[PDB]
Amino acid sequence: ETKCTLKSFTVEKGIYQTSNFRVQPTESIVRFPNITNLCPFGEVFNATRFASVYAWNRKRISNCVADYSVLYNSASFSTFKCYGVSPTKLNDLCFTNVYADSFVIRGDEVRQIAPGQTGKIADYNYKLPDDFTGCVIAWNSNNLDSKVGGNYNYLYRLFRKSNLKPFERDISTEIYQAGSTPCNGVEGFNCYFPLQSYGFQPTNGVGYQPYRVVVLSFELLHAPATVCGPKKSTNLVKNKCVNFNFNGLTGTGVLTESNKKFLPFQQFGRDIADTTDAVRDPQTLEILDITPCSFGGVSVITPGTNTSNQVAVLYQGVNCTEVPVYSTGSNVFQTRAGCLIGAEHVNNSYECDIPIGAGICASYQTSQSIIAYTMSLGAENSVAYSNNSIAIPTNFTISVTTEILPVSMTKTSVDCTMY
Amino acid sequence: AYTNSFTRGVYYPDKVFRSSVLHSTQDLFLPFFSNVTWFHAIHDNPVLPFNDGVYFASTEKSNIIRGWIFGTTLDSKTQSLLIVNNATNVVIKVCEFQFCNDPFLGVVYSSANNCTFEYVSQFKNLREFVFKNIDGYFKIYSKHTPINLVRDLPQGFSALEPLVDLPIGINITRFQTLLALHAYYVGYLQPRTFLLKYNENGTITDAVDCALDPLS
Amino acid sequence: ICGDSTECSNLLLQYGSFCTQLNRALTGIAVEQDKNTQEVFAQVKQIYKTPPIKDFGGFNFSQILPDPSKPSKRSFIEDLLFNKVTLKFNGLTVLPPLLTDEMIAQYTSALLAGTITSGWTFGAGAALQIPFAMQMAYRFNGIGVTQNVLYENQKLIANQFNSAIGKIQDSLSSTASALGKLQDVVNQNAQALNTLVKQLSSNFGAISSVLNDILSRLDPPEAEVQIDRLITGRLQSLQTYVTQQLIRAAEIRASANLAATKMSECVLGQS
Amino acid sequence: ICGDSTECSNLLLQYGSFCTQLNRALTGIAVEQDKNTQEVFAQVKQIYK
Amino acid sequence: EAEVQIDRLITGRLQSLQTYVTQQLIRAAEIRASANLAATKMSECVLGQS
Ligand SMILES: *[C@@H]1O[C@H](CO)[C@@H](O[C@@H]2O[C@H](CO)[C@@H](O)[C@H](O)[C@H]2NC(C)=O)[C@H](O)[C@H]1NC(C)=O
Ligand SMILES: *[C@@H]1O[C@H](CO)[C@@H](O[C@@H]2O[C@H](CO)[C@@H](O)[C@H](O)[C@H]2NC(C)=O)[C@H](O)[C@H]1NC(C)=O
Ligand SMILES: *[C@@H]1O[C@H](CO)[C@@H](O[C@@H]2O[C@H](CO)[C@@H](O)[C@H](O)[C@H]2NC(C)=O)[C@H](O)[C@H]1NC(C)=O
Ligand SMILES: *[C@@H]1O[C@H](CO)[C@@H](O[C@@H]2O[C@H](CO)[C@@H](O)[C@H](O)[C@H]2NC(C)=O)[C@H](O)[C@H]1NC(C)=O
Ligand SMILES: *[C@@H]1O[C@H](CO)[C@@H](O[C@@H]2O[C@H](CO)[C@@H](O)[C@H](O)[C@H]2NC(C)=O)[C@H](O)[C@H]1NC(C)=O
Ligand SMILES: *[C@@H]1O[C@H](CO)[C@@H](O[C@@H]2O[C@H](CO)[C@@H](O)[C@H](O)[C@H]2NC(C)=O)[C@H](O)[C@H]1NC(C)=O
Ligand SMILES: *[C@@H]1O[C@H](CO)[C@@H](O[C@@H]2O[C@H](CO)[C@@H](O)[C@H](O)[C@H]2NC(C)=O)[C@H](O)[C@H]1NC(C)=O
Ligand SMILES: *[C@@H]1O[C@H](CO)[C@@H](O)[C@H](O)[C@H]1NC(C)=O
Ligand SMILES: *[C@@H]1O[C@H](CO)[C@@H](O)[C@H](O)[C@H]1NC(C)=O
Ligand SMILES: *[C@@H]1O[C@H](CO)[C@@H](O)[C@H](O)[C@H]1NC(C)=O
Ligand SMILES: *[C@@H]1O[C@H](CO)[C@@H](O)[C@H](O)[C@H]1NC(C)=O
Ligand SMILES: *[C@@H]1O[C@H](CO)[C@@H](O)[C@H](O)[C@H]1NC(C)=O
Ligand SMILES: *[C@@H]1O[C@H](CO)[C@@H](O)[C@H](O)[C@H]1NC(C)=O
């Protein structure tokens, strides 16, 4: 690593920085509000009676937390196919509101409910707009409609030349007599009732069995979100590097117990620069502290490739109990500036060679090993000062010393347009 | 008559705990040393403009000042809010009511056409309220604790904490108080800049304006 | 810049090798600070010790010499100075200095014991013992006042010096705000670091200042554009901080060179 | 940068707080020049004639 | 679109060149200070006695 960083095949005695290490995370945790208001969908699908196709029933629903996965896996439906929206993702979307349309159709009219389609009820009873609708759910109802249902309680409208606009109900019961020239040239005759009855019999087939049908249309991005899908949760752990959510505020760190006191209305504290420091979860309503996971750069102390081929590894500013060959290694020496591994420790003290920090340094100088010691400021002596004693030199030596001072450097110019 | 608002009208803007930090905020508040239109409805509730959230006050500790009616037409044409009390709890409904000339309330109801939402919740004592509206969120703050710093005047320093937040999303430009059958300040809010000092427990203890005096 | 995100690292690795430059500059200034302290303080080749008995012709140095009673072996004025002046989130670290406080105190005590017992001869060879009075005689002879003056008015000089040192101790103890320069240096460093970490939460023209939400909210096609804007803003801010640090380091280096010259000239000799 | 504009100030305040440190540095160098002149020239306590 | 690509190249290279010239100015100032110290030492310790 040192050779890669220095980009050379020879290195000199000293300390170098190679890279940095960061503790890897672990399993994630997610928390969410404790209770969820269940949307009353039992009265929608398990309804006593559904009106006729020309007078189908409306419902507006919002401010709900309803799970659709618990309904998709249900096999009590003749057909459950949805348009443009993946049902498996319905738990990860939020909508302004939802509109439910309930009615009952015949067995062979299932294909008539689709955008851009042609048919009697498709264009004259309920026209689906030329855009995305939520989707249609249909299920058999011969148990409750083809056996004990009303003989003519279910009706359709055989009124033509009045192609209805999308989301339009014409419940006006008017006898269809034109009263003008284009009906046998007579007024009053050719009068046919706009409505007609379904023909159903006990076990009459497949295309005549009445089917209960609900059409769901979701309004998206038209207003602030009001209805959303429920989200699961999990348990928590302590004293481990974890990535967490806590109701929306994702972050990585280690969890601890805190003594801080929140007022009954805050959500999460901080200290400065948006750095979250304390969070409180809804299920337990307990305040807890967040501490960033440990990290830091590593360094290598080497005596030079020319001399030998052994190094000592220093981790900077980390409690060396959890560093994870260098997972157990040689004698770990924890100092004030991290921990040093690969070198021995002595109580002796000599001159400093390769500075490290915190008043200690490592070298091989006072067998064939690196030793880290506490540097010594120099020799030690005392002079016997007394009030009537003097010391006068008698011999002298002249010496020569050398000093080097730079005075100049290279003069360069850089072209602008060419470069 | 008119009254001078010494220091009233500072509240918690967000829901973030803080400790021993001098935090500068840029949010619409009540300017210090402002004018408030004191009313004397004793032996009269005129109509007032809304103008992006209002202060409110009172000083009577009995069951007279009960209801708030909000809206822009005060008719069944447009939905009208209604906040009242029946000695135990509070109802909030965005359903439509018809006009009331002299409604009477205390321990009015005209029509319920297009009723869509419902909500149920829980020296004298002065009850401060602040009504705010931001992007379809209607916020109501409250304070029910008085300070006897001076007599006959509400001088001192106090904060306000949110209690009701509603994601209804309607635009209101008119509001009236309601009484029974047989005295409150009003102020407006402006987008000023404030500096807030938090106590060791996270409670506001001192607020200073940023656009009042050179020393400020 | 990235905060452990794959796409941020992928986008960042194509901008070149500026990080090598930033790390090299920071390591250079750190080594410069270490060598600067080493040069300003390490000026002796031994560590002298004062004799157990003290009779300096009437003077009283008890308030300057190190006190063994204190665990740090620091004199009274040192304690007053330390008690007077007062002062790892997202990838920032503070390395510890090479020389701790105890070795600095030992160096200062060595310098002071050498300048008391020996005078100026301990800076030009081997230290030579010399009585204190016959050192003030030489120092007076230096400035043109003949040495006859000192031996005739020794008690007055001792009393004046003791009164002056008591006065200076009282002035340090009572009047504060006499240590402005160090306080300003520390405050400027803290303010620069604090504003650098504050600049991280700014929007910088993107949709939001949080990278995880902006990556998980939209599809890549505009996500790389938003991430690019955030990256370039943060990089420019970091560059500004580095330049400020370089300027301040150069200024401190000049001041410390002046201090080293003053110490080497006035302490070890006569000016 | 803006010159008496409304939205330009809105975009400018979104970029952070550069102007704070810019003005701080400029005021610092101004005060430094003042102290510099005072220190180089004012070297006596009395005035002689 | 070629102009967009050329714009990106230009802004990147301009930033790099600015950084280089700033570093160069700092180094030049430091060397000038050292040279002034050397000139003082030469003029004082050689032509006379210190
Ligand atoms: C209509 O009722 C049936 C019967 O209750 C519901 O089917 C599930 O029935 C089991 C056993 O009775 C219950 O434990 C489940 O809770 C029922 N499902 C749900 C989603 O509640 C059926 O779901 C009902 N139809 C609805 C709710 O639309
Ligand atoms: C949040 O929901 C959980 C689970 O329903 C509640 O935890 C239970 O609370 C009851 C209270 O009597 C205890 O008897 C149970 O032992 C608890 N179970 C667990 C697994 O902790 C909790 O009380 C709810 N908290 C709130 C504020 O609603
Ligand atoms: C590394 O962490 C350990 C904790 O596992 C620290 O151990 C401490 O040891 C002292 C002395 O016995 C105890 O008084 C503390 O209570 C221990 N800490 C804890 C959290 O219990 C150890 O000191 C740490 N190392 C460094 C260098 O900080
Ligand atoms: C001058 O005399 C003093 C005291 O007699 C000497 O100091 C001691 O000398 C002896 C020599 O046997 C050493 O063992 C002691 O360690 C010295 N004491 C101290 C405190 O260092 C001093 O060495 C003499 N000077 C010379 C040049 O001989
Ligand atoms: C001062 O020291 C010098 C050497 O540092 C002494 O000169 C040496 O004297 C011895 C004995 O006569 C010779 O063997 C050496 O060859 C000499 N060395 C040199 C370099 O000339 C000198 O004698 C000493 N003077 C006194 C007065 O002690
Ligand atoms: C902050 O909250 C605490 C506890 O809720 C309040 O209680 C005081 O806490 C301090 C600190 O330990 C104690 O010295 C007092 O004796 C406590 N007083 C009482 C009556 O319990 C405290 O009053 C709140 N405010 C402040 C400023 O601390
Ligand atoms: C030298 O000065 C010290 C000042 O620290 C003197 O110590 C003080 O002496 C007075 C007089 O008795 C006491 O009241 C103080 O409590 C002492 N201070 C300390 C810190 O001990 C010391 O007496 C002086 N000695 C000489 C010989 O002048
Ligand atoms: C290796 O180091 C030794 C001692 O420092 C030296 O004598 C020798 O020349 C060095 N070898 C090389 C190839 O530099
Ligand atoms: C230093 O001495 C102490 C005390 O005897 C001992 O416990 C310790 O192991 C010694 N250190 C080494 C490196 O031998
Ligand atoms: C309201 O403002 C007017 C000036 O416009 C002032 O004269 C009056 O005193 C104010 N009312 C108060 C302070 O109650
Ligand atoms: C008002 O009184 C009626 C009478 O019982 C009660 O139903 C209603 O709940 C009261 N108001 C509120 C807000 O609860
Ligand atoms: C109720 O509101 C709806 C809007 O969704 C409107 O179509 C209808 O006419 C309203 N009802 C009355 C009686 O005004
Ligand atoms: C806002 O007010 C306008 C009237 O100016 C109204 O048309 C609009 O519906 C209001 N918006 C909401 C969300 O109520």
Numbering used by the authors:
A (entry chain A): 298 to 621, 635 to 676, 689 to 741
B (entry chain B): 27 to 69, 80 to 143, 159 to 173, 186 to 245, 264 to 297
C (entry chain B): 742 to 828, 854 to 1037
D (entry chain C): 742 to 790
E (entry chain A): 988 to 1037
The paper states:
The SARS-CoV-2 S protein (hereafter S protein) is responsible for host recognition and viral entry. The D614G mutation in the spike protein of SARS-CoV-2 alters the fitness of the virus, leading to the dominant form observed in the COVID-19 pandemic. Here we demonstrated by cryo-electron microscopy that the D614G mutation resulted in increased propensity of multiple receptor-binding domains (RBDs) in an upward conformation poised for host receptor binding.
In this work, we determined the cryo-EM structure of S-D614G and revealed the high degree of conformational heterogeneity mostly confined within the RBDs. Multiple substates within the one RBD-up or two RBD-up conformational space were determined. Collectively, 62% of the total population of S-D614G had one RBD in an up conformation (one RBD-up), including three distinct substates that separated the RBD conformations, and 38% of the population had two RBDs in an up conformation (two RBD-up) with two different substates. The three distinct RBD-up substrates in the one RBD-up class showed a 39 to 52° upward rotation with respect to the hinge defined as the Cα atom of the beginning of RBD, i.e., residue 330. Contrary to S-D614, we did not observe any all RBD-down conformation in S-D614G, in line with the previous study of a similar construct without the transmembrane domain, but differs from the full-length S-D614G that exhibits significant amount of closed, all RBD-down conformation. Compared with the wild-type S (hereafter S-D614), the increased propensity of S-D614G in the RBD-up conformation implicated the facilitation of the binding to the receptor ACE2. However, our cryo-EM structure of S-D614G showed no appreciable structural difference in the proximity of the mutation site with respect to some of the extremities of the reported S-D614 structures, including the first reported structures of S-D614 (4, 5), the acid-stabilized form of S-D614 (22), the disulfide- and proline-stabilized HexPro-S variant, and the furin-cleaved S-D614 that adopts a more open conformation. Meanwhile, Benton et al. proposed that the loss of a key salt bridge formed by D614 of one protomer and K584 or the other protomer due to the D614G mutation leads to local disorder, thereby increasing the dynamics of S-D614G and more populated RBD-up conformations, a finding that could be confirmed by our cryo-EM structures.
